[PDB]
Amino acid sequence: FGVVFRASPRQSDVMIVAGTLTNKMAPALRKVYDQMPEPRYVVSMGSCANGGGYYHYSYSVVRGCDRIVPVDIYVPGCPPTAEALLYGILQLQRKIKREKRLRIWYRR
Amino acid sequence: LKKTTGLVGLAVCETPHERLKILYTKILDVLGQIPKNAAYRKYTEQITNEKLGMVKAEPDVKKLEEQLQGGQIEEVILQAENELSLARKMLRWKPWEPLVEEPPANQWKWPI
């Protein structure tokens, strides 16, 4: 599908957030999100970080991944089957395809 | 002699027997200060002298470690080495009292 995992945000755009988040970890996450080039995206994944999921009630989790970054598509699962993920990202492409900054920019 | 050694940290030591005699003698001597009071001197000497009796009894090594009932006597010499510093601790800990202190009985009552 052309997607290829390449480390170092500066050479990457969309971000997967697989797996449970924790308190100490969060600031690093916000750092990495900030250092990405526009047009950056992210993808919450699993019941993991959609909102704590299984670990919704503990002192160290940070509920949703939503509460530190502006998520795009969600891919519910625990773990989501990798294929359901695949449907996830294809859905992400079917959301980029509806992007239209140029049509709007001319309009404004 | 014995090629290898088995355990990576273990270092092959030819002619254990001498070193063994220094072992058990240092044993009995360093524990020789134990007042007859504590039963430690009793048991530990009990086995010690038995094993050492096998030491004199068994100049050969190949069946010797079939005699000490411990794989690679080469390690257990260091076991005894542990017992040496053990005895070095035994009297720093002094001869044994019939219990220091007792915990309040309100505790130690499981369940809750």
């Binding site: 308190n23 100490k24 969060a26 600031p27 916000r30 919704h56 009630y57 503990s58 002192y59 160290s60 940070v62 509920r63 509460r67 530190i68 970054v69 | 504590a38 039963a39 430690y40 048991y43 530990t44 086995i47 411990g70 794989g71 076991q79 005894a80 542990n82 017992e83 510093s85 053990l86 601790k89 800990w93 044994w96 009292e97 019939p98 219990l99 220091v100 202190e101 007792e102 915990p103 309040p104 309100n106 505790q107 130690w108 009552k109 369940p111 809750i112």
Partner: protein, 208 residues
């Protein structure tokens, strides 16, 4: 009474019993009692001051060549004159068998660290320190792990809410993630499953 119930060997119960007696006599300056859990698990007690000397011998041969801590657990209980209740598993190899010494401790009394005696206990001192109040003396470096930085209050204190007292969230006006009191949604629904009628006549304490 065969297919379901476990057979429970008498033999092991014997050997552990006698061995418990064996250590009980060898060093009784401190062994409060050498109870054998009936499913073959020996476990002697220790006066809290007595930790190092016992464990020390516990590595030292007689039979107690119980090398390697399996763990350094810290059971809590709100009652008792001293709440926290530390526990040490141990394993001997050549005689392949496990024992479990344990003590007790005040919220405030500093029991000594046992890192030197069992060798691989450096991480645990830090653990129990940051999961509890209890302090270990002669420990090279207690410090937080399994937490955030500040965070403060020890968890696992048997009290202390699981939801804690705080939360992080990113805040654009200051452009930074920040702490803030829990504001928790949905609330931890708390069932009270526990039920009347004691199931266990074989235990059950005297009414007193």
């Amino acid at each position: 009474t065969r297919p379901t119930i476990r057979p429970r060997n008498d033999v092991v119960h014997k050997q552990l019993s006698a061995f418990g007696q064996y250590v009980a006599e060898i060093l009784p300056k401190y062994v409060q009692q050498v109870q054998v859990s009936c499913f073959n698990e020996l476990e002697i007690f220790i006066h809290p001051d007595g930790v190092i000397p016992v464990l020390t011998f516990l590595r030292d041969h007689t039979n107690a060549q119980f090398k390697s801590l399996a763990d350094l657990t810290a059971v809590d209980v709100p009652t008792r004159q001293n709440r926290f209740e530390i526990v040490y598993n141990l394993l001997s190899l050549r005689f392949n068998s496990r024992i479990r010494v344990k003590t007790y401790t005040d919220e405030l009394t500093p029991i000594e660290s046992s890192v030197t005696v069992y060798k691989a206990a450096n991480w645990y001192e830090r653990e129990i320190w940051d999961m509890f109040g209890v302090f270990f003396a002669n420990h090279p470096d207690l410090r937080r792990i399994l937490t955030d930085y500040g965070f403060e209050g020890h968890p696992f204190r048997k009290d202390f809410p699981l939801s804690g007292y705080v939360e992080l969230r990113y805040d654009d006006e200051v452009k930074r993630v920040v702490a803030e009191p829990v504001e928790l949604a949905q609330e931890f629904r708390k069932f009270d499953l526990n039920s009347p009628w004691e199931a266990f006549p074989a235990y059950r304490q005297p009414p007193e």
